[PDB]
Design an enzyme around this catalytic site. Structure first.
Site, PDB file in Angstrom:
ATOM      1  CB  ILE B  27      -1.010   2.677   6.285  1.00  0.00           C
ATOM      2  CG1 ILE B  27       0.322   1.963   6.697  1.00  0.00           C
ATOM      3  CG2 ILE B  27      -0.833   4.186   6.189  1.00  0.00           C
ATOM      4  CD1 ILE B  27       1.571   2.147   5.724  1.00  0.00           C
ATOM      5  CG  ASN B  29      -4.085  -1.596  13.694  1.00  0.00           C
ATOM      6  OD1 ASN B  29      -3.346  -1.260  14.649  1.00  0.00           O
ATOM      7  ND2 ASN B  29      -4.787  -0.914  13.043  1.00  0.00           N
ATOM      8  N   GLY B  30      -2.034  -5.417  12.685  1.00  0.00           N
ATOM      9  CA  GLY B  30      -2.137  -7.020  12.486  1.00  0.00           C
ATOM     10  C   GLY B  30      -1.700  -7.693  13.890  1.00  0.00           C
ATOM     11  CB  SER B  31      -1.254 -11.158  14.691  1.00  0.00           C
ATOM     12  OG  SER B  31      -0.185 -11.555  13.934  1.00  0.00           O
ATOM     13  CG  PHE B  32       2.708  -7.454  12.587  1.00  0.00           C
ATOM     14  CD1 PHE B  32       3.142  -6.125  12.643  1.00  0.00           C
ATOM     15  CD2 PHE B  32       1.702  -7.870  11.540  1.00  0.00           C
ATOM     16  CE1 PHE B  32       2.413  -5.151  11.769  1.00  0.00           C
ATOM     17  CE2 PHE B  32       1.219  -7.126  10.696  1.00  0.00           C
ATOM     18  CZ  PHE B  32       1.355  -5.752  10.752  1.00  0.00           C
ATOM     19  N   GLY B  33       1.393  -6.387  15.344  1.00  0.00           N
ATOM     20  CA  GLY B  33       1.686  -4.911  15.743  1.00  0.00           C
ATOM     21  C   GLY B  33       0.975  -4.070  14.827  1.00  0.00           C
ATOM     22  CB  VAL B  35       2.276  -0.986   9.179  1.00  0.00           C
ATOM     23  CG1 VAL B  35       3.064  -0.427   8.086  1.00  0.00           C
ATOM     24  CG2 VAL B  35       2.328  -2.572   9.372  1.00  0.00           C
ATOM     25  CE  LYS B  50       5.817  -6.756  10.480  1.00  0.00           C
ATOM     26  NZ  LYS B  50       6.017  -7.843   9.541  1.00  0.00           N
ATOM     27  CG  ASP B 140       1.311 -14.745   4.944  1.00  0.00           C
ATOM     28  OD1 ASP B 140       0.283 -15.628   4.684  1.00  0.00           O
ATOM     29  OD2 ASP B 140       0.957 -13.915   5.789  1.00  0.00           O
TER      30      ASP B 140
HETATM   31  O1  LIG Z   1      -0.120  -0.373   2.107  1.00  0.00           O
HETATM   32  C1  LIG Z   1       0.506   0.258   1.515  1.00  0.00           C
HETATM   33  N1  LIG Z   1       1.880   0.370   1.157  1.00  0.00           N
HETATM   34  C2  LIG Z   1       2.757  -0.165   2.049  1.00  0.00           C
HETATM   35  C3  LIG Z   1       2.506  -1.131   2.852  1.00  0.00           C
HETATM   36  C4  LIG Z   1       3.568  -1.937   3.560  1.00  0.00           C
HETATM   37  C5  LIG Z   1       3.024  -2.739   4.729  1.00  0.00           C
HETATM   38  C6  LIG Z   1       1.913  -3.009   4.992  1.00  0.00           C
HETATM   39  C7  LIG Z   1       1.690  -3.997   6.161  1.00  0.00           C
HETATM   40  C8  LIG Z   1       2.485  -4.847   6.524  1.00  0.00           C
HETATM   41  C9  LIG Z   1       2.229  -5.887   7.332  1.00  0.00           C
HETATM   42  C10 LIG Z   1       3.103  -6.794   7.800  1.00  0.00           C
HETATM   43  N2  LIG Z   1       4.646  -6.629   7.448  1.00  0.00           N
HETATM   44  C11 LIG Z   1       4.768  -5.570   6.551  1.00  0.00           C
HETATM   45  C12 LIG Z   1       3.885  -4.714   5.978  1.00  0.00           C
HETATM   46  C13 LIG Z   1       4.398  -3.520   5.085  1.00  0.00           C
HETATM   47  C14 LIG Z   1       4.751  -1.454   3.214  1.00  0.00           C
HETATM   48  C15 LIG Z   1       5.169  -0.453   2.289  1.00  0.00           C
HETATM   49  N3  LIG Z   1       4.070   0.073   1.693  1.00  0.00           N
HETATM   50  C16 LIG Z   1      -0.458   1.077   0.484  1.00  0.00           C
HETATM   51  C17 LIG Z   1      -1.827   0.640   0.065  1.00  0.00           C
HETATM   52  C18 LIG Z   1      -1.660   2.037   1.039  1.00  0.00           C
END
Ligand SMILES: O=C(Nc1cc(-c2ccc3ccncc3c2)ccn1)C1CC1
Ligand SMILES: O=C(Nc1cc(-c2ccc3ccncc3c2)ccn1)C1CC1
EC number: 2.7.11.26
Lengths: 347, 341
Positions: B27, B29-33, B35, B50, B140
């Site tokens: 769901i 991607n990022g610089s961290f890795g 999700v 994550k 952030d």
């Molecule tokens: O993305 C969604 N839900 C969601 C995202 C995350 C979520 C997404 C990206 C992250 C990047 C870095 N650190 C934590 C993160 C947590 C966590 C729980 N629920 C819904 C819009 C689809």
């Protein structure tokens, strides 16, 4: 609606002329103000008019810099004039150029293709030549990015534009760290250095090169910490020494501990090894270790451009790449040995 | 198909348990890795996993194991997996984000109803009150890091990958926080900032929800600063000094302040504008604390015993404050906890 003004020519002695223009439309907004496109009544030629609020306190720095520049790879200031608009406005009348590297790169990206390497060579060479020229005046652009690289698709001519951030850098005199745009900032800027040099432009140009080869930005991220992680993923963690040459007082912070990724594995298999070699010599942590712009022009990646047989795919000749002035060559005159090919020396 | 791991509960003592999950999909991607989303076999509950490379100890994990608050995404479990080693943080999955919801309204040329602006911002300020009370700064704050359940209107703060316990006199990197939401002291490269940078970021989110677009846009610090100056006016020497010394003697755009009322549409509630102007202050110590923001009159409607959500349901729990949460200013309890709570 025809607009008529008495405008001052960008170059030469102050001899104002009546200038009429029409068909005005907005082609850009920003923090600076507004950029309009217009058509000159006299010649039918298109211009871009950058309109900015004028500080009552001093001469506009961008104007002062642009009045000094005269180079085929820098967008020409045709005229400037002052006007109202509700406070006084400065209007910079620039040659209009039909494309940008930003837009062209987007077209290839969305078509799932990459810009042909011959154009990567041509565009980046011209960018480095524009940098060699401005740097020779001590002038740093400070906002090199694809949106500021104008292109004429037919002639393959590139012109550097937007000198709104540009500054003559003086050793020992502080500069704001917060210039340069997301994706293109040298690590020393990310670290908030105020004592940087013109080599920040060379880092930015290296990001543009990498991006043209990859099809996407090499160091993306909306925060400096994300950008730095992406940089570290490629260059490896910077040493204490490398950190000292970017920004002291960042010596003791906690950084990700990643081994350097081999530069060859960064790009696609087809990527020419000279292009990769060139990227690695531009995208260096230690600012004084990066190539100068003139040294970049002389790099092996651009050898094809120096071939007397080279042509554009259009069939056209390449633009003039070899008529270096003494001013352009001044950082290292004997580089002309490489820069000016034998056939460019025929009497 | 089905993945089984031995995971450590995010809270309580280190007693790992077998945890099975399925339906794994990316769901983000990022610089961290990366999700992932997954479904727990036991409960059928959705989680976000994550996954980051593990180094020293992981600061994000240490911080998240300490947090327990209804407006912060819960760390359900963590576990390690594989020639390197990864840390996996198992978070409650939340269906929406403020980023996505604001975009839906923006694209439809509509504004998010003010009742949701009150609800979301109030809960964000609660989460900040809580983490700041531990000395922890998120660093952030932005719409993508604000998770939403649209049915219940619950907001949960997420992504503690930049978070740090700030200690007075100990430097911090200036290069955290994201484009549009960075406090001016960060743009100026300050390393001695405080938790009030999260309050500036929160103010930018509030203004953005009211405006339908970011209030201080720009891809460079200089563009962002110009947008800031167009609203707040040129900062004074003193204001600069409080943001970053040695950035005095620099030439700034000499612009007069814009009336905050004329920044927003005519429809905008005056209390929303008043709150904005008290969050987006140059001098970091002049900004409201998160707890003070919670008590602002803009949120009075939330303290009305008759308030309901537009979908007909009751509001989520807004008044269950702890001693820790109120510790920056205990007497605010008399405002924050209404007679009917
Ligand atoms: O993305 C969604 N839900 C969601 C995202 C995350 C979520 C997404 C990206 C992250 C990047 C870095 N650190 C934590 C993160 C947590 C966590 C729980 N629920 C819904 C819009 C689809
Ligand atoms: O934009 C185009 N051409 C163009 C743009 C400009 C142009 C555009 C934006 C600017 C912003 C700030 N400073 C200078 C600028 C110059 C100048 C000449 N030609 C064509 C792609 C449409």
């Amino acid at each position: 609606k025809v607009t008529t003004v008495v405008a001052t020519p960008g170059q030469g002695p102050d001899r104002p002329q009546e200038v009429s223009y029409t068909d005005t439309k907005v082609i850009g907004n920003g923090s600076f103000g507004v950029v309009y496109q217009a058509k000159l009544c006299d010649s039918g030629e298109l211009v871009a008019i950058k309109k900015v609020l004028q500080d009552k306190r001093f001469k506009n720095r961008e104007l002062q810099i642009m009045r000094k520049l005269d180079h085929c790879n820098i967008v020409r200031l045709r005229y400037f004039f002052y006007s109202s608009g509700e406070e006084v406005y400065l209007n910079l009348v620039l040659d209009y150029v039909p494309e940008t590297v930003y837009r062209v790169a987007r077209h290839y990206s969305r078509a799932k293709q990459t810009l042909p390497v011959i154009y990567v060579k041509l565009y980046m060479y011209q960018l480095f030549r524009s940098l060699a020229y401005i740097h020779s005046f001590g002038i740093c652009h400070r906002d090199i990015k694809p949106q500021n690289l104008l292109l004429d698709p037919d002639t393959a001519v590139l012109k550097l534009c937007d000198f709104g951030s540009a500054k003559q850098l003086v050793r020992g005199e502080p500069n704001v760290s917060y210039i340069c745009s997301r994706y293109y900032r040298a690590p020393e800027l990310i670290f908030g250095a105020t004592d940087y040099t013109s080599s920040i432009d060379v880092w930015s140009a290296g990001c543009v090169l990498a991006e043209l080869l990859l099809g996407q930005p090499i160091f993306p991220g909306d925060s400096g910490v994300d950008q730095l992680v992406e940089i570290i993923k490629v260059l490896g963690t910077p040493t204490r020494e490398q950190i000292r040459e970017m920004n002291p007082n960042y010596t003791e912070f906690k950084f990700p501990q990643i081994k350097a990724h081999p530069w060859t594995k960064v790009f696609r298999p087809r990527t020419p090894p000279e292009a990769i070699a060139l990227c690695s010599r531009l995208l260096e942590y230690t600012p004084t270790a990066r190539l100068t712009p003139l040294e970049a022009c002389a790099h092996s990646f651009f050898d094809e451009l120096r071939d007397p047989n080279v042509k554009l795919p259009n069939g056209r000749d390449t633009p003039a790449l070899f008529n270096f002035t003494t001013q352009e060559l001044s950082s290292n005159p004997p580089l002309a040995t490489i820069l000016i090919p034998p056939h460019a020396r025929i009497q």
